[PDB]
Amino acid sequence: YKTGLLLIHPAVTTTPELVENTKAQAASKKVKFVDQFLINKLNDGSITLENAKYETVHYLTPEAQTDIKFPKKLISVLADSLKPNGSLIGLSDIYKVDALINGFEIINEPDYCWIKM
């Protein structure tokens, strides 16, 4: 069974629907998400939980606005909590070059992510 991460921006995910869905996908399979990081509370410094076994990552932010999403410094802090089979289910087009330089390996298998080694 797998121990992972769910990382959420509150705007769509403060109602129960996206939270129940990510939990439904994990639950009918064999993952459970344990560690809940909000975008404003992680950037402020409230949640520091482990530096190791979350090696399955989901980022649910709303993707209908065309504005910019995430800082590079939090991608380096998120990578520091993982191991060579880290597997990100996240981040889009600018983040391709960001995955390259931070040490992620971007695999396009249509849950589109990045597996850090």
From Swiss-Prot:
What does the UniProt PTM comment say about this protein? Answer: Ubiquitinated.
User: Null-mutant phenotype, please?
Assistant: Inviable. Decreases cytosolic iron-sulfur (Fe-S) protein assembly.
Coarse class of the protein's main subcellular location = cytoplasm
Query: Would the keyword Ubl conjugation be found if you checked this record's keyword annotation?
Result: yes
Q: Outline what the protein does.
A: Component of the cytosolic iron-sulfur (Fe-S) protein assembly (CIA) machinery required for the maturation of extramitochondrial Fe-S proteins. Part of an electron transfer chain functioning in an early step of cytosolic Fe-S biogenesis, facilitating the de novo assembly of a [4Fe-4S] cluster on the scaffold complex CFD1-NBP35. Electrons are transferred to DRE2 from NADPH via the FAD- and FMN-containing protein TAH18.
Kindly state the subunit structure of this protein: Monomer. Interacts with TAH18. Interacts with MIA40.
What family does the entry list? Belongs to the anamorsin family.
Q: What is this protein called?
A: Fe-S cluster assembly protein DRE2
Q: Which organism is it from?
A: Saccharomyces cerevisiae (strain ATCC 204508 / S288c)
What gene name is listed for this protein? DRE2
Span covered, complete protein: 4 to 120 of 348
